Design an enzyme around this catalytic site. Sequence first.
Site, mmCIF file in Angstrom:
data_model
loop_
_atom_site.group_PDB
_atom_site.id
_atom_site.type_symbol
_atom_site.label_atom_id
_atom_site.label_comp_id
_atom_site.label_asym_id
_atom_site.label_seq_id
_atom_site.Cartn_x
_atom_site.Cartn_y
_atom_site.Cartn_z
ATOM 1 N N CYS A 172 -3.193 10.587 -17.797
ATOM 2 C CA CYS A 172 -3.808 9.348 -18.481
ATOM 3 C C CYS A 172 -5.161 9.540 -18.704
ATOM 4 O O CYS A 172 -5.692 8.878 -19.556
ATOM 5 C CB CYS A 172 -3.075 8.231 -18.114
ATOM 6 S SG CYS A 172 -1.563 8.114 -18.559
ATOM 7 N N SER A 210 11.743 2.565 -13.656
ATOM 8 C CA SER A 210 10.543 3.102 -14.066
ATOM 9 C C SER A 210 10.713 4.264 -14.931
ATOM 10 O O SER A 210 9.832 4.317 -15.912
ATOM 11 C CB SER A 210 9.786 3.879 -12.684
ATOM 12 O OG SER A 210 8.774 3.153 -12.354
ATOM 13 N N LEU A 260 5.905 5.095 -11.127
ATOM 14 C CA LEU A 260 5.111 4.141 -11.695
ATOM 15 C C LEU A 260 5.350 3.053 -11.204
ATOM 16 O O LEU A 260 6.470 2.363 -11.302
ATOM 17 C CB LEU A 260 5.362 3.943 -13.030
ATOM 18 C CG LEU A 260 4.242 3.647 -14.110
ATOM 19 C CD1 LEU A 260 4.845 2.647 -15.314
ATOM 20 C CD2 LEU A 260 3.077 2.791 -13.513
ATOM 21 N N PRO A 265 -4.619 3.007 -23.854
ATOM 22 C CA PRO A 265 -3.592 2.034 -24.043
ATOM 23 C C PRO A 265 -2.049 2.168 -23.372
ATOM 24 O O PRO A 265 -1.020 2.594 -23.952
ATOM 25 C CB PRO A 265 -3.219 2.277 -25.720
ATOM 26 C CG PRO A 265 -3.339 3.916 -25.655
ATOM 27 C CD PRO A 265 -4.410 4.229 -24.981
ATOM 28 N N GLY A 266 -2.486 2.183 -22.091
ATOM 29 C CA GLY A 266 -1.182 2.388 -20.970
ATOM 30 C C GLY A 266 -0.002 1.562 -21.124
ATOM 31 O O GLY A 266 1.065 2.030 -21.242
ATOM 32 N N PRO A 279 1.145 -2.862 -22.639
ATOM 33 C CA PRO A 279 0.544 -4.344 -22.827
ATOM 34 C C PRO A 279 -0.049 -4.959 -21.678
ATOM 35 O O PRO A 279 -1.075 -5.559 -21.425
ATOM 36 C CB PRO A 279 2.087 -5.064 -23.441
ATOM 37 C CG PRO A 279 2.835 -3.894 -23.878
ATOM 38 C CD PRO A 279 2.444 -2.846 -23.188
ATOM 39 N N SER A 304 -0.441 9.524 -23.442
ATOM 40 C CA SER A 304 -1.241 9.958 -22.186
ATOM 41 C C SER A 304 -2.353 10.370 -22.270
ATOM 42 O O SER A 304 -3.319 9.535 -22.995
ATOM 43 C CB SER A 304 -0.239 11.280 -21.473
ATOM 44 O OG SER A 304 -0.463 11.065 -20.263
#
Lengths: 353, 352
Positions: A138, A180, A241, A278-279, A281, A312
């Site tokens: 990312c 995840s 994650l 923008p990973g 919220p 990503s």
Amino acid sequence: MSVIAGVFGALPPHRYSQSEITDSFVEFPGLKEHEEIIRRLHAAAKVNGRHLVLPLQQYPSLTDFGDANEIFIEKAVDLGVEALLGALDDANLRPSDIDMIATATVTGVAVPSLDARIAGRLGLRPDVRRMPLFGLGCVAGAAGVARLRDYLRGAPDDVAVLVSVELCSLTYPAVKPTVSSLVGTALFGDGAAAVVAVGDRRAEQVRAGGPDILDSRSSLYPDSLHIMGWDVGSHGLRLRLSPDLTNLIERYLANDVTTFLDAHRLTKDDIGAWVSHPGGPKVIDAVATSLALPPEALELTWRSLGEIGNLSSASILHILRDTIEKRPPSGSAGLMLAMGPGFCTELVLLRWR
Amino acid sequence: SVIAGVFGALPPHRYSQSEITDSFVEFPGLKEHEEIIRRLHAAAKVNGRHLVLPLQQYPSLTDFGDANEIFIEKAVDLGVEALLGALDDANLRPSDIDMIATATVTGVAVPSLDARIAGRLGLRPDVRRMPLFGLGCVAGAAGVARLRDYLRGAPDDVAVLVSVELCSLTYPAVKPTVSSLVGTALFGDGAAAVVAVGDRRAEQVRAGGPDILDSRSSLYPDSLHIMGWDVGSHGLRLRLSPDLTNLIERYLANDVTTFLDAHRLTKDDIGAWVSHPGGPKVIDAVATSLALPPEALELTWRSLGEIGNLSSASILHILRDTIEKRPPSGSAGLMLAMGPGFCTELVLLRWR
Ligand SMILES: CC(C)(COP(=O)(O)OP(=O)(O)OC[C@H]1O[C@@H](n2cnc3c(N)ncnc32)[C@H](O)[C@@H]1OP(=O)(O)O)[C@@H](O)C(=O)NCCC(=O)NCCS
Ligand SMILES: CCCCCCCCCCCCCCCC(=O)O
Ligand SMILES: CCCCCCCCCCCCCCCC(=O)O
């Protein structure tokens, strides 16, 4: 210290609504039993639509890594050359002009690399310099841009290109209904982007109109290897994650931003345009909070997240182009803010023209 | 810019080629290929190789997930060992490093090895990272080229290249095909590192090794099929085509003449040849296409026999060998590697 001459986004033609994706998704094999949490996660994702490289209903047939990764190579080169060509034409440049090509993906395994294939397809010079960046994930949108300056710093007449291509949906063979992975099915879409940058002397020559890349700073967090990445195996690329991610941003990002802007005698209020990855919220809120930002500051990344999901590495380059369309005032500063597997963070100082 | 240290690292498990071959034919399902294998293993002109695992453990390495996990742990260990050893050669410290580039093609790690290496060695949190994946056997040379490109824009900085290739760990993928078998005759495990400093840093740090003058890449048209990975459920399967040597014989002279003409140099002006040991048939074709004396290539012939083919790492082991023999001051050196692309990379060195 150079200057962007072209930014261009590219997306697969298949566009679906989040609700369309969720409705068909909960009807897949193995998955109906988990409908409740899938619906919750997909609603909570703040993504209203995503582009996908395959027709939605093809995915239950995508069980084999070998098939997935072969489709990855075919489709990634396609999107990459479509992204590059769009960027070249935006920059009034052409394939033979490129002295160095970088390539960012975390989402397929290509040997020979993507850059090699894109170079062959677009007819770049046989002596083009190849930088295949894999496993930055990312962060590679910001990181690739930083690396481009690092090249053009030592080559003022040169042209360098970054092509990001992320086909998250093709990692489906590794996907199973664990939390995840399911989080993943809520955020990630497919897309690609290309940045064409030029050296300082070449900038006047080609009327480079994009922003000036002034500086960058990497920031690597200790003992945070487990936060993000893949657990690679026979079923492919399985997402890792941790929930703890958001906490790490809250304690350390303000620090990294302030330590970097200080070295330019600026502070975060002198930044006229934020371009954040923008990973998700919770992540976007976190960087908003820890940096004490007004909600207008990150509006474009919220909107990109909404329209196309998380791409990503390519996301930040989509949001970068969106803000270039917005035309911030000349001489004002901009800041790219990306984060990913490491755990790390990448800041890129910009100057708008 | 200018190299300050070169250091190789290998697994402590070392076996003679015959130890390997004998064990190997008794593995699951390769008893009915004893003949072809023994022919292939003997004709590799490798006399021994370092294995990252015990030789008896390999029959159990059938799962790509297992092998890749072991890759990650063993690769950070070896990589750290090489950097340390090159840091020591430079008389420099982890805190001096401004940019680390990593090259592998034998394992898939996210986060990358540079992430993990920086952690183990306490590099600055602001160290620049450049993980390179998929350059294959060209990355030893192409990596040095990337360092020179970085240091040309940062003449006060220190940049390193760590190359870690654990080829044996791709065993999940091999079957009794000519391609895969040839690879089991050739490929060993090991790692290597290069520390290099900008021009303005060269004096202050008394950088011993060679100046890095130039590089040229050469990506051949319509040549994807020549070399690469067949990626799948069983991991990384070797794709190696017969037409490789004929590609070299046809286009290698053009590539090197073109490069050397840009410096107005001839093949005779090159004092030290630093070439990738892609096996006997490849080394023959390099010599043949470039009309070199059996002398010129012996250091890479030597590496091939002692250590086997370490993918991108081999050319750096040989660079360390050429350096320790000390070519004459001011004389010229050419690194010459080739990898998946199909491509070729040349790096011009000047010695001290
Ligand atoms: C995925 C997301 C949109 C959904 O969030 P949401 O429905 O409000 O749910 P919450 O985060 O409040 O968490 C509630 C539950 O989901 C779980 N959860 C959330 N994210 C998780 C993850 N990445 N891994 C495992 N569990 C997770 C929590 O553990 C919790 O479980 P519990 O109720 O049994 O205790 C949100 O968590 C998010 O934005 N994550 C960040 C994604 C990311 O890390 N991107 C990295 C790119 S840089
Ligand atoms: C149900 C069809 C669509 C499925 C879409 C999501 C498929 C992939 C889920 C995992 C995505 C992981 C992206 C990781 C990027 C990174 O690690 O930096
Ligand atoms: C008993 C086993 C001993 C070890 C056998 C190891 C065999 C490895 C075969 C594959 C090597 C692949 C190297 C590819 C390099 C590249 O991508 O250019």
